Amino acid sequence: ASEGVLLGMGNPLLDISAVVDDAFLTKYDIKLNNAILAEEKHLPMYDELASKSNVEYIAGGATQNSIRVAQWMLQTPGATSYMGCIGKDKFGEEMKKNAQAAGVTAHYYEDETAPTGTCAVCVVGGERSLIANLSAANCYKSEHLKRPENWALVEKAKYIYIAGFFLTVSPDSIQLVAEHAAANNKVFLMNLSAPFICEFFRDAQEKVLPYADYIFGNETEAKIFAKVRGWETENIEEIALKISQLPLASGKQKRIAVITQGADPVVVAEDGKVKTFPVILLPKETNGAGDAFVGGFLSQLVLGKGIEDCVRAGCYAANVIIQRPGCTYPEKPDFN
Amino acid sequence: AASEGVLLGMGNPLLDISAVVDDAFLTKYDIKLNNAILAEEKHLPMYDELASKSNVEYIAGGATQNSIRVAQWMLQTPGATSYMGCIGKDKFGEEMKKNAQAAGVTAHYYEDETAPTGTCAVCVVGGERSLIANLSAANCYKSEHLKRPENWALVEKAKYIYIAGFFLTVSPDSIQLVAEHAAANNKVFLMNLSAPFICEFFRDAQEKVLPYADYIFGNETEAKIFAKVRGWETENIEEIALKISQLPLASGKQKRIAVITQGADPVVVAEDGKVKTFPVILLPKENGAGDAFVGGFLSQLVLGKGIEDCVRAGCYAANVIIQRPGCTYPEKPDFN
Ligand SMILES: Nc1ncnc2c1ncn2[C@@H]1O[C@H](COP(=O)(O)OP(=O)(O)CP(=O)(O)O)[C@@H](O)[C@H]1O
Ligand SMILES: Nc1ncnc2c1ncn2[C@@H]1O[C@H](COP(=O)(O)OP(=O)(O)CP(=O)(O)O)[C@@H](O)[C@H]1O
């Protein structure tokens, strides 16, 4: 677990989590077990959540959550890094404060006008309501990555994880680091989180797939990925195998596809074979479970462990996060 | 014979810089034909090279704006169409205003104070093309522009309002405001399934606007993905079109018409619980075909014509645009 051994790049959103009541949900007309794009009526909501003393600020975003969970799972200081776009405002300073507290060496790109991306995480029991305002998170430029103090994080990194969503924000950055990983013996990892499915983004994803050593995804993302490229099969075990056997780049030898199915087992394809991994629960046990699974998987991958340890750690971290308000965790882990 | 501003469009405007190119140009900038590539930044050496070419053509593009220009060209009545979208304060923004005025579209653009105007290089060789789109200011539209009286007057004047599904990612407030207004003031709100959604932020935003859609346009790929997202196991495009037309309707919305194109294969239309097939009829000795189909369909819909006339006009306009470099057309149409 060397300095900056694992790097992430994505859309950072400051998650403003707080336990709410019926009056709050009725006031802003927001329903539980739902995630909506933020509107004008939901913009003054971030001030009412701040006025609550029990508010929790977290440097969120799908990839950043995976990086924080990996840092928490590893515990070695300075092992993780992250790059993403934020705004020059109070929420941007809270993002920098929380990333430092989580142990992540974050080098953010500050946009000169777009305010920092935020996500209200309203909690009642186990249920949640997400209201994301992406705003600055979609303004990352490759000029930031190409600067020497930020490109040093790529050079230091052995494992680089980038979500498929980043292909819509900065396709130059993902392609540049994926090609660099193939040339300098680094492991490039990615996921099938491609919300937009246009010809522009399909061809952008087609160009980065050969450079992916690991492709993470969930049953819904994998089934849609299969239907897009004409694969008629619907069996998740067959789709995972077909993902692992996609064309490989010159600097690659094999690919591992990890498809989670929530409660159902985690499916892993490797060396032309598919293995099933039943989910093991914690003593007396969905928001951000996928992000926490990738985080736990990345931690054991960094330590040079076998696939079974990576799946068990992923499931452990996903089980911890779902029993907590948001993508939070205790001080130290209890995994083996 | 259509009234002033009877048809309005809202979207992501991009100045399409079209030009016929050769092998040396495609090799120089490493760009492939029949490929849609994103441009994180304007490649100035390429853009300036295109601007210095014989038969270089500037067009006020963008999927929705193309449909509006094709509808204006098909109608021929001056002042019948309107359009609102975000542009930058630069030379390409002035060329967008010049071409929209030439195309006969009353365009009221929102000028961003820093993001440069969205552009798209349309490198055409024979029948094939290569799109290199830099969205930039097109993704910066704010509902404050729509709510201004000189711009809201275009909504009030409009009987038919067409907005692409992709615009939900840019301004979901503007779509919800005009879709709910159309239901309250007996106006026809039309939309398409462009860039189908997989993330819950964008899926729930689309779920909120579907009841307000009187017409839903789409292609076989968009419709098949839309069906797989919401658990519809059927793959038959005729069954999918019927299921789209029978989605929940908003108060005071009696019916929905779903139009699913299949390229060469017939156009599928669902109406009053029945699906009708329309074979594509070609012109004597025969990208952007979908945009031109919607444009031709909108023109006859404005004139209060039957569905068969709308499909024939849509196919006529699509067949003209595909035998021209880009989404261009002759002075007057030949469809009666
Ligand atoms: N109901 C459940 N019970 C226990 N563990 C669960 C679970 N749902 C998910 N998990 C854990 O989370 C991991 C990832 O689950 P899943 O694939 O559903 O995530 P996701 O990111 O797609 C879901 P969401 O949309 O709820 O954020 C699983 O491999 C498992 O370890
Ligand atoms: N090969 C072909 N020959 C003739 N007409 C065609 C055609 N492909 C498309 N069209 C015309 O264009 C209309 C829309 O076609 P389609 O559904 O393929 O558009 P689209 O916008 O999805 C395609 P693209 O990705 O190429 O821009 C059809 O209804 C038909 O009138």
Numbering used by the authors:
A (entry chain A): 3 to 287, 292 to 342
B (entry chain B): 2 to 287, 293 to 342
Sentences from the paper on this structure:
Structural and kinetic analyses revealed a catalytically inactive unique dimer.
Since the ATP site was accessible, we obtained a complex of ZmADK2 with AMP-PCP in the open conformation. The Ado moiety of ATP is surrounded by hydrophobic residues. Indeed, its ring is located between Ile328 and Ala295 on one side, and Ala265 with Gly264 on the other, forming multiple hydrophobic contacts.
